[PDB]
């Protein structure tokens, strides 16, 4: 969980 805004990283893949 890199840089998300929720339950999955929306950036940096995961």
């Amino acid at each position: 969980h890199q840089v998300p805004s929720g339950p999955n990283p929306l950036h940096n893949k995961k």
Side-chain angles (χ1 to χ4, degrees):
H1 277 259
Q2 314 308 328
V3 188
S5 49
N8 65 275
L10 291 315
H11 194 87
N12 302 92
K13 183 185 295 179
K14 63 176 187 63

PDB file of all heavy atoms in Angstrom:
ATOM      1  N   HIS A   1       0.843  -1.216   0.000  1.00  0.00           N
ATOM      2  CA  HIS A   1       0.000   0.000   0.000  1.00  0.00           C
ATOM      3  C   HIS A   1       0.869   1.254   0.000  1.00  0.00           C
ATOM      4  O   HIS A   1       1.140   1.827   1.054  1.00  0.00           O
ATOM      5  CB  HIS A   1      -0.961   0.022   1.200  1.00  0.00           C
ATOM      6  CG  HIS A   1      -2.221  -0.769   0.993  1.00  0.00           C
ATOM      7  ND1 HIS A   1      -3.430  -0.185   0.666  1.00  0.00           N
ATOM      8  CD2 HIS A   1      -2.462  -2.101   1.061  1.00  0.00           C
ATOM      9  CE1 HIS A   1      -4.351  -1.120   0.536  1.00  0.00           C
ATOM     10  NE2 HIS A   1      -3.791  -2.291   0.772  1.00  0.00           N
ATOM     11  N   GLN A   2       1.297   1.677  -1.187  1.00  0.00           N
ATOM     12  CA  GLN A   2       2.211   2.811  -1.313  1.00  0.00           C
ATOM     13  C   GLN A   2       1.502   4.151  -1.093  1.00  0.00           C
ATOM     14  O   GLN A   2       1.449   4.650   0.031  1.00  0.00           O
ATOM     15  CB  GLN A   2       2.903   2.807  -2.681  1.00  0.00           C
ATOM     16  CG  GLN A   2       3.452   1.450  -3.090  1.00  0.00           C
ATOM     17  CD  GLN A   2       4.343   0.819  -2.038  1.00  0.00           C
ATOM     18  OE1 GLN A   2       5.043   1.505  -1.296  1.00  0.00           O
ATOM     19  NE2 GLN A   2       4.301  -0.500  -1.958  1.00  0.00           N
ATOM     20  N   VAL A   3       0.947   4.729  -2.160  1.00  0.00           N
ATOM     21  CA  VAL A   3       0.323   6.051  -2.072  1.00  0.00           C
ATOM     22  C   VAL A   3      -1.133   6.023  -2.558  1.00  0.00           C
ATOM     23  O   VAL A   3      -1.449   6.485  -3.656  1.00  0.00           O
ATOM     24  CB  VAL A   3       1.111   7.103  -2.892  1.00  0.00           C
ATOM     25  CG1 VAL A   3       0.578   8.504  -2.636  1.00  0.00           C
ATOM     26  CG2 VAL A   3       2.598   7.033  -2.573  1.00  0.00           C
ATOM     27  N   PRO A   4      -2.033   5.426  -1.768  1.00  0.00           N
ATOM     28  CA  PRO A   4      -3.465   5.375  -2.059  1.00  0.00           C
ATOM     29  C   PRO A   4      -4.259   6.523  -1.449  1.00  0.00           C
ATOM     30  O   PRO A   4      -3.710   7.439  -0.836  1.00  0.00           O
ATOM     31  CB  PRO A   4      -3.899   4.063  -1.380  1.00  0.00           C
ATOM     32  CG  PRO A   4      -2.633   3.472  -0.852  1.00  0.00           C
ATOM     33  CD  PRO A   4      -1.753   4.645  -0.577  1.00  0.00           C
ATOM     34  N   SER A   5      -5.562   6.440  -1.650  1.00  0.00           N
ATOM     35  CA  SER A   5      -6.531   7.284  -0.981  1.00  0.00           C
ATOM     36  C   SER A   5      -7.750   6.425  -0.663  1.00  0.00           C
ATOM     37  O   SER A   5      -8.889   6.883  -0.696  1.00  0.00           O
ATOM     38  CB  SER A   5      -6.910   8.470  -1.870  1.00  0.00           C
ATOM     39  OG  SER A   5      -7.232   8.039  -3.183  1.00  0.00           O
ATOM     40  N   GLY A   6      -7.474   5.160  -0.367  1.00  0.00           N
ATOM     41  CA  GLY A   6      -8.515   4.175  -0.170  1.00  0.00           C
ATOM     42  C   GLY A   6      -7.923   2.802   0.089  1.00  0.00           C
ATOM     43  O   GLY A   6      -6.779   2.704   0.529  1.00  0.00           O
ATOM     44  N   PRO A   7      -8.658   1.720  -0.208  1.00  0.00           N
ATOM     45  CA  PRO A   7      -8.225   0.351   0.100  1.00  0.00           C
ATOM     46  C   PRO A   7      -7.273  -0.248  -0.933  1.00  0.00           C
ATOM     47  O   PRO A   7      -7.001  -1.451  -0.908  1.00  0.00           O
ATOM     48  CB  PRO A   7      -9.545  -0.415   0.115  1.00  0.00           C
ATOM     49  CG  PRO A   7     -10.399   0.289  -0.885  1.00  0.00           C
ATOM     50  CD  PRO A   7      -9.982   1.739  -0.860  1.00  0.00           C
ATOM     51  N   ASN A   8      -6.760   0.574  -1.838  1.00  0.00           N
ATOM     52  CA  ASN A   8      -5.789   0.110  -2.809  1.00  0.00           C
ATOM     53  C   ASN A   8      -5.014   1.295  -3.355  1.00  0.00           C
ATOM     54  O   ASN A   8      -5.593   2.345  -3.622  1.00  0.00           O
ATOM     55  CB  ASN A   8      -6.490  -0.666  -3.932  1.00  0.00           C
ATOM     56  CG  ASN A   8      -7.431   0.190  -4.767  1.00  0.00           C
ATOM     57  OD1 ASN A   8      -8.592   0.394  -4.406  1.00  0.00           O
ATOM     58  ND2 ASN A   8      -6.952   0.672  -5.903  1.00  0.00           N
ATOM     59  N   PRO A   9      -3.682   1.171  -3.465  1.00  0.00           N
ATOM     60  CA  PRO A   9      -2.823   2.249  -3.967  1.00  0.00           C
ATOM     61  C   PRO A   9      -3.176   2.644  -5.377  1.00  0.00           C
ATOM     62  O   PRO A   9      -3.106   1.837  -6.301  1.00  0.00           O
ATOM     63  CB  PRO A   9      -1.415   1.658  -3.894  1.00  0.00           C
ATOM     64  CG  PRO A   9      -1.543   0.602  -2.863  1.00  0.00           C
ATOM     65  CD  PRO A   9      -2.889  -0.010  -3.099  1.00  0.00           C
ATOM     66  N   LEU A  10      -3.555   3.898  -5.532  1.00  0.00           N
ATOM     67  CA  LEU A  10      -3.979   4.401  -6.830  1.00  0.00           C
ATOM     68  C   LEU A  10      -2.773   4.821  -7.662  1.00  0.00           C
ATOM     69  O   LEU A  10      -2.908   5.324  -8.777  1.00  0.00           O
ATOM     70  CB  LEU A  10      -4.950   5.586  -6.698  1.00  0.00           C
ATOM     71  CG  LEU A  10      -6.347   5.270  -6.146  1.00  0.00           C
ATOM     72  CD1 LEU A  10      -6.921   4.027  -6.803  1.00  0.00           C
ATOM     73  CD2 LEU A  10      -6.318   5.124  -4.635  1.00  0.00           C
ATOM     74  N   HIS A  11      -1.599   4.594  -7.105  1.00  0.00           N
ATOM     75  CA  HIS A  11      -0.347   4.984  -7.729  1.00  0.00           C
ATOM     76  C   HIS A  11       0.777   4.167  -7.117  1.00  0.00           C
ATOM     77  O   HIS A  11       0.643   3.679  -5.991  1.00  0.00           O
ATOM     78  CB  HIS A  11      -0.105   6.490  -7.530  1.00  0.00           C
ATOM     79  CG  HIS A  11       0.979   7.075  -8.388  1.00  0.00           C
ATOM     80  ND1 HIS A  11       0.753   7.552  -9.660  1.00  0.00           N
ATOM     81  CD2 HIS A  11       2.295   7.287  -8.141  1.00  0.00           C
ATOM     82  CE1 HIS A  11       1.879   8.029 -10.156  1.00  0.00           C
ATOM     83  NE2 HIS A  11       2.831   7.881  -9.255  1.00  0.00           N
ATOM     84  N   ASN A  12       1.864   4.007  -7.872  1.00  0.00           N
ATOM     85  CA  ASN A  12       3.001   3.182  -7.463  1.00  0.00           C
ATOM     86  C   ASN A  12       2.600   1.713  -7.461  1.00  0.00           C
ATOM     87  O   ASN A  12       3.221   0.887  -6.788  1.00  0.00           O
ATOM     88  CB  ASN A  12       3.539   3.582  -6.082  1.00  0.00           C
ATOM     89  CG  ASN A  12       3.968   5.034  -6.010  1.00  0.00           C
ATOM     90  OD1 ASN A  12       3.181   5.906  -5.650  1.00  0.00           O
ATOM     91  ND2 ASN A  12       5.215   5.303  -6.356  1.00  0.00           N
ATOM     92  N   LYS A  13       1.541   1.414  -8.217  1.00  0.00           N
ATOM     93  CA  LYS A  13       1.030   0.052  -8.383  1.00  0.00           C
ATOM     94  C   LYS A  13       0.337  -0.445  -7.112  1.00  0.00           C
ATOM     95  O   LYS A  13      -0.894  -0.435  -7.031  1.00  0.00           O
ATOM     96  CB  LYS A  13       2.143  -0.918  -8.804  1.00  0.00           C
ATOM     97  CG  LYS A  13       1.651  -2.334  -9.070  1.00  0.00           C
ATOM     98  CD  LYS A  13       2.799  -3.285  -9.358  1.00  0.00           C
ATOM     99  CE  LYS A  13       3.527  -2.924 -10.643  1.00  0.00           C
ATOM    100  NZ  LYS A  13       4.663  -3.846 -10.913  1.00  0.00           N
ATOM    101  N   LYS A  14       1.115  -0.866  -6.119  1.00  0.00           N
ATOM    102  CA  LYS A  14       0.553  -1.406  -4.888  1.00  0.00           C
ATOM    103  C   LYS A  14       1.566  -1.323  -3.749  1.00  0.00           C
ATOM    104  O   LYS A  14       1.239  -0.730  -2.703  1.00  0.00           O
ATOM    105  CB  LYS A  14       0.076  -2.852  -5.083  1.00  0.00           C
ATOM    106  CG  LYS A  14       1.181  -3.831  -5.444  1.00  0.00           C
ATOM    107  CD  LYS A  14       0.657  -5.250  -5.531  1.00  0.00           C
ATOM    108  CE  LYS A  14       1.785  -6.246  -5.730  1.00  0.00           C
ATOM    109  NZ  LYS A  14       2.727  -6.256  -4.577  1.00  0.00           N
TER     110      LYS A  14
END
